[PDB]
């Protein structure tokens, strides 16, 4: 039972499918060019499935607990990109 | 190194290889000898 702290890498699993959120290597190529697509994959191997939490505003800092009402930004570990 | 692989992938995605090949394939403007036995030279600072 880890508690989430700003700075950890989390594993988001789809409740229905049982598969994990990840940044897919392929992209829809709608002029994004330097961006990927976010989907689901079975395998947990690799850093694609992992996402790092970062604070939204200046009040929250790195290393403190994650609150229910707080906003956050997720960074893909493999593609260093944000959910956009 | 994961960081090195990531950076290489970023640069590869940013700059396609075909664009580099085409830009290299772009031709120059050769200096040309003309009448009176003198050369006309394209300007360095105003061209490729």
UniProtKB/Swiss-Prot annotation, chain A:
Q: List all disulphide bridges recorded for this chain.
A: none
Subcellular location per UniProt equals: Sarcoplasmic reticulum membrane
Q: What is this protein's tissue specificity according to the annotation?
A: Detected in heart muscle (at protein level). Heart muscle, brain (cerebellum and hippocampus) and placenta.
Instruction: Pinpoint the MIR domain residues.
Output: 1-56
PTM text:
Channel activity is modulated by phosphorylation. Phosphorylation is increased in failing heart, leading to calcium leaks and increased cytoplasmic Ca(2+) levels.
Q: What induces it?
A: By TGFB1.
What domain of life is recorded for the organism?
A: Eukaryota
**What does the record give as the function of this protein?**
Cytosolic calcium-activated calcium channel that mediates the release of Ca(2+) from the sarcoplasmic reticulum into the cytosol and thereby plays a key role in triggering cardiac muscle contraction. Aberrant channel activation can lead to cardiac arrhythmia. In cardiac myocytes, calcium release is triggered by increased Ca(2+) cytosolic levels due to activation of the L-type calcium channel CACNA1C. The calcium channel activity is modulated by formation of heterotetramers with RYR3. Required for cellular calcium ion homeostasis. Required for embryonic heart development.
**What free text does the record give on domains?**
The calcium release channel activity resides in the C-terminal region while the remaining part of the protein resides in the cytoplasm.
Disease linkage in the record? Ventricular tachycardia, catecholaminergic polymorphic, 1, with or without atrial dysfunction and/or dilated cardiomyopathy: An arrhythmogenic disorder characterized by stress-induced, bidirectional ventricular tachycardia that may degenerate into cardiac arrest and cause sudden death. Patients present with recurrent syncope, seizures, or sudden death after physical activity or emotional stress. CPVT1 inheritance is autosomal dominant.
Please describe the quaternary structure of this protein. Homotetramer. Can also form heterotetramers with RYR1 and RYR3. Interacts with FKBP1A and FKBP1B; these interactions may stabilize the channel in its closed state and prevent Ca(2+) leaks. Interacts with CALM and S100A1; these interactions regulate channel activity. Identified in a complex composed of RYR2, FKBP1B, PKA catalytic subunit, PRKAR2A, AKAP6, and the protein phosphatases PP2A and PP1. Interacts directly with FKBP1B, PKA, PP1 and PP2A. Interacts with SELENON. In cardiac muscles, identified in a complex, composed of FSD2, CMYA5 and RYR2.
Question: What is stated as this protein's family in its record?
Answer: Belongs to the ryanodine receptor (TC 1.A.3.1) family. RYR2 subfamily.
Record protein name field: Ryanodine receptor 2
**Originating organism:** Homo sapiens (Human)
């Amino acid at each position: 039972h880890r508690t989430l702290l700003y700075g950890h890498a989390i594993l988001l699993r789809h409740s229905y499918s049982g598969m994990y959120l990840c940044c897919l290597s392929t992209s829809r190529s709608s002029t994004d060019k330097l961006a990927f697509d976010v989907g689901l994959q079975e395998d947990t191997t690799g850093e694609a499935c992992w996402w790092t939490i970062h604070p939204a505003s200046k009040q929250r800092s790195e290393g403190e607990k994650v609150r229910v009402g707080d906003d956050l930004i997720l960074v893909s570990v493999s593609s260093e990109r944000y959910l956009h | 190194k994961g960081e090195a692989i990531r950076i290489r992938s970023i640069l590869r995605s940013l700059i396609p290889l075909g664009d580099l090949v085409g830009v290299i394939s772009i031709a120059f403007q050769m200096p040309t000898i003309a009448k009176d036995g003198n050369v006309v030279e394209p300007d360095m600072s105003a061209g490729f």
